[PDB]
Structure formats: structure tokens, C-alpha cells
């Protein structure tokens, strides 16, 4: 928790919600009368709906960091950070300030960047003050050969362009070079090693079957053969005003197939799948 979506038809969709929503790839996921959407949800939800630690996509910000040789770099380290960044969650790592003669006084600082990345600074100083959620790094009382710690928190608002920039100490020719890349696309199971997937009429793209042309259906199950998608819907809803296999169902070429319930002793029958009974 929490995630807040609203008809998310795709991972990257979903993921792009917020930092709390989380895409079940899992086949077959959406019942009947579940919409694609239901895919989109909080991780403890979908788990819970029964989608499986390998089915939930869930990319994560994330640091790398590289130190190089040695001189190389005396007084800043680590010397390179790569940043993976999903929208509106932070990416923390660490920055090590040693003093070699100056200065008793340092601030930590980046480059102007643009209005979609947040920076801020903790200064965990030797004196021992602490400050947090900072604008820049600050300590007083930095010695010789004690080393500072100061932690980059770094927040994208939306999936960026990959680009880089830099952290520096106040007065000193140090350079924490950062790259910074998005993380909004998911990794998804593919129907490379099934041809039967989509039952061979459509792409698996996370989950959701996108149908050839002739092809309708979660699964692309069903040939229309061109009575219209709409005729076929039609057979599935009471009236034009009025929802398809009432909420409860999906229109399998032209049939309403009820969602089954596991609930004592529940029933979803009826032509639209109108009929809720609870004493079945
Ligand atoms: C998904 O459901 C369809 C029902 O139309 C079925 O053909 C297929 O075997 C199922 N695939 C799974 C569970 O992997
Ligand atoms: C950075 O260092 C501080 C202070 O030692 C520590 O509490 C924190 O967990 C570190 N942060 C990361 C991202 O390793
Ligand atoms: C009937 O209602 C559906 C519901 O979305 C809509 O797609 C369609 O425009 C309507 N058709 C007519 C001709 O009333």
C-alpha cells in the first residue's frame, strides 16, 4: 500500500502510478468480469489474490556505485554512482568526504538540475552533529583522517531521460560523477517458448493478450469471423445502457461466462450473469 490507479492497461502504466503499485503478469490472472486493471495493484494485494513472487513485476530505485583504482580519488569517494530511478522513490547512497588538510568546514552540493529530480542531504558529521533531508551536505568540525559520511537521497517525479551529474565539496577539485537512468519498464515473460500462448492469435505483452485482427477474448479464443465485436458483446448485456455479463462475467464470443465463487454457497448465474445468489 498504497496504490492509486485508474484504468492502467499495461505494466510500465502501472508502474507509473506510483511507487506503491505493483504488475501481476501472471496468465489468466483477471477472472470473469475482472478488467485488465485489476492487474495493477499493491504487492500484498496481488499475492494475496494469488499472483506468484515471479509474476509481480515491481521494478525498484536503486545505486551502484564504482571506486576507482586508487589516485584515482583521495578525498571524495565513491567516485562513480549509477542511479535507477522509478517515480517518486528515492534512491539512497553514501558519500565519504576525508579530509587531507582543509577544511575544517564542508558543504556538499550537485549541479543545477532539472525540476524533475529532488536531491537532498544527510550530514552525518564527526562532532557529532547529524542534519537530514538537507538541500546540501553541511559539517562542522571535519578532522584529518576521521572521514564524514554524508547520505544522497535522489527522487525522480517522473520516468527521466538518462543523464548525469555531479557532487562536489565546497573549495575542493573532488567529483562524484552520477548517472542517472529511469526505471519504468518492466521485464516480462515473453511467448517465445509457447506457441499456444494467446492460443497463437495474439502478443503476450505481461500478462494481457492483444489479439490479431479476427481475434477477441482474454486468450484470443474466440474467431469472429466477422459477426461484429459488437454483436458478439451484445448477446453478453440486458441493455445498451447496462454493463457487460453484469460485471460479474466475461463475453466469451458472444456467451456471458459467469465468475465461479468458492464462497458457500454462492452462485453467479443467469444469460448476463445476473442472478447473485447466496443460498445455492
Ligand atoms: C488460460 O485460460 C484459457 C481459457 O480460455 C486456457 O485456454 C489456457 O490454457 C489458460 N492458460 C494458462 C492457465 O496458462
Ligand atoms: C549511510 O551511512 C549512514 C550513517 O553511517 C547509515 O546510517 C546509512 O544506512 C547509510 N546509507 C546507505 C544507503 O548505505
Ligand atoms: C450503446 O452504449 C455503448 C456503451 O458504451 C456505447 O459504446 C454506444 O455508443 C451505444 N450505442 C448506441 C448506438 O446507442
Known amino acids: 500500500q498504497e496504490c492509486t490507479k485508474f484504468k492502467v492497461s499495461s505494466c510500465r502504466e502501472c508502474i507509473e502510478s506510483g511507487p506503491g503499485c505493483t504488475w501481476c503478469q501472471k496468465l489468466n490472472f483477471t477472472g470473469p468480469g475482472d478488467p485488465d486493471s485489476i492487474r495493477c495493484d499493491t504487492r ?7 499472483c506468484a513472487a515471479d509474476d509481480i513485476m515491481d521494478p525498484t530505485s536503486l545505486a551502484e556505485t564504482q571506486e576507482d583504482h586508487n ?21 539512497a547512497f553514501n558519500v565519504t568526504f576525508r ?15 532539472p525540476d524533475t529530480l529532488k ?12 542534519h537530514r533531508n538537507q538541500p546540501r551536505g553541511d559539517c562542522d568540525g571535519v578532522q584529518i583522517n576521521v572521514p564524514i559520511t554524508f547520505q544522497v537521497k535522489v527522487t525522480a517525479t517522473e520516468c527521466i531521460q538518462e543523464q548525469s551529474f555531479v557532487i562536489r565539496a565546497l573549495g575542493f577539485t573532488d567529483i562524484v560523477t552520477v548517472q542517472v537512468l529511469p526505471q519504468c519498464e518492466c521485464r516480462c515473460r515473453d511467448q517465445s517458448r509457447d ?45 445498451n445502457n447496462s454493463i457487460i455479463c453484469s460485471g460479474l462475467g466475461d463475453c466469451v464470443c458472444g456467451q456471458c461466462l459467469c465468475h465461479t465463487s468458492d464462497v458457500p454457497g454462492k452462485l453467479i448465474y443467469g444469460q448476463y450473469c445476473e442472478h447473485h445468489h447466496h443460498h445455492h
Open 44 to 50: 500484498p494485494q496481488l499475492l494475496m489474490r494469488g
Open 195 to 239: 506457441r499456444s500462448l494467446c492460443h497463437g492469435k495474439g502478443f503476450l505483452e505481461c500478462g494481457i493478450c492483444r489479439c490479431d485482427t479476427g481475434y477477441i477474448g482474454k486468450n484470443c479464443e474466440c474467431q469472429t469471423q466477422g459477426r461484429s465485436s459488437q454483436e458478439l458483446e451484445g448477446s453478453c448485456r440486458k441493455d
Open 99 to 113: 579530509r587531507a588538510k582543509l577544511s575544517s568546514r564542508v558543504f556538499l552540493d550537485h549541479n543545477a538540475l
Open 119 to 130: 536531491v537532498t542531504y544527510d550530514s552525518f558529521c564527526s562532532n557529532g552533529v547529524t
Open 71 to 91: 589516485g584515482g580519488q583521495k578525498q571524495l569517494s565513491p567516485q562513480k554512482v549509477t542511479l535507477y530511478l522509478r517515480p517518486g522513490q528515492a534512491a
